[model samples]
Target: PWQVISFDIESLGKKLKDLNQACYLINAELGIAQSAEVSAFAPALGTQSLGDSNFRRVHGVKYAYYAGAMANGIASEELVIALGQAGILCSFGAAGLIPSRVEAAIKRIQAALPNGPYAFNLIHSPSEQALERGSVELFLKHQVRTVEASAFLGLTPQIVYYRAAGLSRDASGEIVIGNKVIAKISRTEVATKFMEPAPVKILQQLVNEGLISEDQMLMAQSVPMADDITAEADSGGHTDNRPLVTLLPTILALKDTIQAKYQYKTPIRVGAGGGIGTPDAALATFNMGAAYIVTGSINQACVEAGASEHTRKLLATTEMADVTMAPAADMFEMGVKLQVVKRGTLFPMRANKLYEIYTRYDSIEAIAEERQKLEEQVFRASLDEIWAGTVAHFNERPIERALDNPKRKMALIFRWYLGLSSRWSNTGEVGREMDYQIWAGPALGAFNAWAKGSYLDDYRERNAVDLAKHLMQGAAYQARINLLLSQGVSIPVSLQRWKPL
Candidate 1:
């Protein structure tokens, strides 16, 4: 046993040495060579590559960790800038904002980190194709090099255009693709579409409409629609609630199959997200052959997260069972659910009740008098008053379908209350603390448990970069501890008893 453990440690040391050397050379090339003091610990603990060097090299980020986009700017411009400056990637939460606001945030993010890596979210809107297309056009206008495409079930002409718009043949024979798409998907069918090139029909239609040149379309044929695919499993907001263990490998196998079929010039990478908040979770995903990993829920607890202090305080005290699935506000018409904080809040119960009412009654007037009185009391408004506010809100950016259909109008009124609950949480509206709707997952609780007695114990001290460093360092430390155990080296009783949170 002693001999076997020593041999394994030796093997691990060799691998670490090789990785350290590679990083040293890369740093030298970038003109940021490590000092002797810093280099001394390089072998034992350093920036280790995840799966491939291509993800880091192509994205120009030091680490393969990313802060996944949260809607309503919850991921925040400040969060994106901090991650970019720390040589990590993040997506601006551009999903729920108006175009003008989104454009301004993009500009500010670009200005803050001129040469750093950053991306923006392009959430799919099957009900509103025009909105999706408009978002794509904004991305193109800004010349955004990367996008986190979320909630797309299949290929769309707009996504294809974004992927193919920057295609060109280099001086060499290889096709050079400018825009990089990191598709966040949970389903195998969706993952497969991103792993292949844009559909021929979509490309031709874009070309015919003069959206892209024929030459560009030709160049697009050689590249996958997305440069990377992030296999998102059971996490917050618009999720299929698949387990990462089951979803990741299936997507990886699909990636290999599609790659073989297309024979693309570059390897298409698959990463993992959803429920990644601790070192153990991160390491497990990486060991599963994830090219990189994206994190969401834990970031919501960080100081720069675009949410109220009250929300962060509430999130910091969560436990694994504190989150519950409730009807999603944005896609309530489709009856989709999202994981959210259920502890110390009535949002989930109230949201579910509203969805039940939506399904049970064709019109608000059809409800019985007693139930109608209860509804008014809960919503704190009369049906007519709620409809009036909804009408005013929609008039700002009117939806044609809602205006034409009475049933749709009722749904819109309900949706408005659901959305207002989130705003109440985000803004910490004093009287509505019970209705605070925080979009979170169990990862926050996991993170809280791990950080209980550490320097990260205080939610106020939690910075995005510091959290990233802690997780990466912890992972390297765990690797070394395991190696030592393998070599028959007796660990301290306290250390030996420690387990992943």
Candidate 2:
């Protein structure tokens, strides 16, 4: 009966006093028994009812909202626990860290969220196959039930193993997937691959390696590699910067085609990420049939985020145009670039310069004229000095192959700066302020503008859980307006804008 609540019959037509009273009146029209009243007032748009309940049911979370991993521990251990405790799902930024660090995080997060609705980030490390396999090993060892796989251009043996090895039959003889993958993709081909079943070749490879059983391999073929694929659009880091409006529908169409082809028991869930810093963005995504919504840049600016105070301040002050694309350290050789903050930093300009130099010159020696300028101005160290450190850094890392070719060596040396720049910002290196690299998108700016005068205006005051709740609540509130308007109820001018409670 509580599910369809209504106001006292005599309380109808009362003038609403404030936001709370307006919301109360809207929520009051819940009963089918009060069908006339429901028609006169707004329908129920509870936070839980805003998005697909299947997402909440499957993930075991209160809402269908999640914060995407920002990678390199920027999303942080503290951030995961903070959100997880609040019944929100958030992936730890385990992508760029080493196994030991990732493992430590896994242990802590598991201990905190024992009944877990939590996840860890498993970024595609095409350049480091060993690291990718090691990440899967760690996830399995810790029994990390869910993972957010981002930047996957294609399926790999490591990722395929994660899915196949976890397959088993339940009591009803249905495939029981122990592991869940939430893939992030902006393009249709990548989206199509994730929505379809796992590649047989990779499954065979895992089988031959004795990583999975033949029966498990067969079971994996019955289901899509990931039922949860995030349609990540123009957001921070490792993005194609596709617009969510066009990108989501394209992927949604791909999901339909793949699901129809496979005829799986459950339909694939395509989530929306990027450009989701505001309530309107969240509502728009849900309106477009997004199974869930994932936030990124905005989360990094939160206090729970593992970014330095300085970095947070810079992000808090970001405008929509503050972001620009820069060379990605992990895939720099392939010319892959990720979005980074442009305001109050030279990272984008400097990073692109290194990429240009790597492309134009065959080796470090070929750019001899620019060497002194680079050493004195950009890198702040002699070429030989950086190389000496790079060699020691990759001791058993197999990048020794670079020693044979200077061009490869040049790429790696340049990557040192590209890679460290992000960490430098995370740690807030005093002198390297000009070199700080913060991954962000236009969404951060949108969030900042919306939150400018609210309690969340100060970076220090922005709590992860608070932001999550307000956005969801605000979305529901906005949703009710649409619901009322659809039934021809004239919305009041006072309730047009939703302020933080």
Candidate 3:
């Protein structure tokens, strides 16, 4: 100032010292920063309440960010452990693994993380109750504290029991409910069910069936079925194609309404996932009052992600328009669509063609001669051979529907090629790159563009923890800039000191 106006320099110095100490502790535990300077500069970039303290208290994680479960171990043991070690929550994809394999993965994760927060994905299996029941038993046996429930249209007895089994009262009469659930849903109806307590009828049924105790049923009456509800919009596999702008607010309001109606001890939270790859997207969700955020598509490109180097490289080159919808392999008969990459693969077109055939014909024998011949030629195996292989695969592993129904048999054969397409891509099977089926969304493309010329530009260099730090720091920096701009203050020269390391 022209008159050299006095300021409280000592107080400012003390505040800065305190902030630096906080940053140091956080960085040291998470192993995110390489130096004190980077740590000090990065924490200054976050907005208040955006830290998701409530989520941290409930989940015991350092950050509100999560890595969503991708099926078939795509979210891998390594990825989950890495994130857990960094004090971030992650879910192991347990959808496709057999019971024994899932058990092994669970054991490995427990050994590695010990006290870290981790979860397992429990995908809904409407056609197969045995699979669902078996999975729930495994979860119980493992003493898994949390689960990420996906593709559920309504609450099930198994889910209700999982949430209720851990209920007890603390010394002060405060309800201590364990076995937290994070439900990933896209529809408003589904969100409402998760936001409220478990349905009484279902709980009664479980009690009658001797699946859950009478006392457990009473405990379930007071708590919502799930502790957290993640509103999943259009992204990656098996999406409903809803936009987050409308979905998040609708669910948030529903969350508020339900909390008031129940008046539960713990406030149920609403988070956002899908299409959240960039800092801008994360910021938008936080601004919309999302309690936390979950990331999906972008994490597949990380080093620890269970995907091939070739797939990661291809994912790094995607654009906003590079992704398209195709029939899902697991639910082919239901006509469910999964978002996948179209920029460098023929998967979308071929999968769509198979669906068209499936709709038009009851069986492979009913197809037109020319089209059937073309299909055989493309598959590099005759229809008879494909059918034989399908029969052996199904009979040996024995999916119930495939064994019982002729229509399901036809669908299973068609589904084989779709399944193989994904396997080929993930394993980098030679000579099948053009036919690679990479399940992805436009978010990774958006991330690639954002990281261009930056340290994260190389997909190989990306790590889950580092990526989280970058996004968090970027969000904070943007918040700081927005505050300065709104106040009509000139940007300080020292503000440039917070550049990415």
Candidate 4:
């Protein structure tokens, strides 16, 4: 039901087909491959080994911060350097003013490690209008070479207008048009919507008039189904999880059609993101022809990654059903129903409570008898019980101050953030059972199953590269590998054994 139209030559068409084929094959392999054992407290060994003067060498990591919120915690300087040494890429999800922050972070990172191949992961924030201007300015000032534009944020009408109006400049001192200045645009739906007709048609028209060269466009189309869904479980955000098999095929098919219609050889490099954890999953993605891959959830458990030790341990023990989609309080900044996860405690349950509260804004206070009874149990007391008992507890601020401050008006908002943070870090607090969101994969259960009765203790302490290599070479390999790829033991190499002599 999805489509893309292009009008490139037959040779380019064949190349597109080859690329798509490669993507399809790799994804299939990842899906079929056996899930690997996951680590719970896997330390960032790579980042821990670096000296203070060597922070710029981080590479290959999806996030440059290397860890998560934990970056705010211990041995940060050493961790940063070690991550740089290990080639881990750094990225931040702070959407607005992120470019400035990125510029600052990169300077700190480079100063710490002078020879890293790091790139920034620029996520699309809800404040796209403001963030765009700031991000462009920051990129220009810092001379950032590579950027991973967030979905919807990167592919939008504004970018086109920005280019047309000469709002963006390039190395040649000319207005940057078409993807050259932009390294990669994340996700297919966003890329297609922005690159195709409707809003994108105007830019396409300019290209058609030879105003923009096809080669200048370098969009990295990704499908955020898996990661987006998982992120919803964790942060409560918007998403669509079209099955990997289905989405990949649709994107490839669309790419074929789009190329044929446009007569342009724009390399539509598809990157598989969302819900990829195990190497098997990666293999499946590559088999499906993904140019590369991006992961989020599993990294939380990695030693040098982010999140709390307790959160990591909780995720390690979690089953697929452990994660559930619920409303996100953070999305209030964007005025949307952000999906989030409910893990150790009832954060989702609490969020669902607020959702019900916000939806029934009219008579939330004047409840009926049945609803009143339920509210008593849910709120831990009757409405009348707290009407005047502790005005300081429920209504901390005066009505005048509360009127203009939405944050002050919202009950327990700060508590929610702190509670979630406490649980994620596994600080061993008493309420650990109720505050954290646990983002994980269905493959997790399979991982636990394999680790049963094995010597590999604490699955969360392992490394990603090691796990990836193992699956690619392990005898238990169920996933297929690409016929291509020059390094490491791939599924294709193992397949040769089954070939008839």
Model 2 alpha-carbon drift over 4 Å, by segment:
1-39
In terms of TM-score, the best-performing candidate is 2
- What is the per-residue lDDT of model 1 for residues 1-501, given as tens digits with 9 covering 90 to 100? 011012233343343333343211111111112223211122334556455578999999888778999888988999999999989999999987889999998889989988768999999998899899999999899888899998898999999999999888778767887888999998888888888878889999999999999889888877888998999988976677889899999998998888888888798999999888787888778878799888879998899988889888888888889999999888898898999899989889988988898898877656657457545556777777888877777788674786677678778888877888888876779978888888887778888888887767777888999888766655655555455456444444444322332
Alpha carbon lDDT of residue 254, candidate 1? Answer: 93
**Clash total of candidate 4:** 97
Best by lDDT: 2
TM-score of every candidate relative to the true structure: 0.89, 0.91, 0.88, 0.57
Model 1 regions more than 4 Å off: 1-45, 368-376, 399-406, 496-501
Model with the higher lDDT, candidate 1 or 3: 1
The C-alpha local distance difference test score for the whole of candidate 3 amounts to: 0.78
lDDT of each: 0.80, 0.83, 0.78, 0.41
Q: Lowest lDDT 10-mer window, candidate 1?
A: 23-32
What value does the lDDT take at residue 151 in candidate 1? 88
Q: Give the TM-score of candidate 1.
A: 0.89
lDDT of 4 by residue, 302-352 (tens): 455445666656666655566666554445433344334455667667656
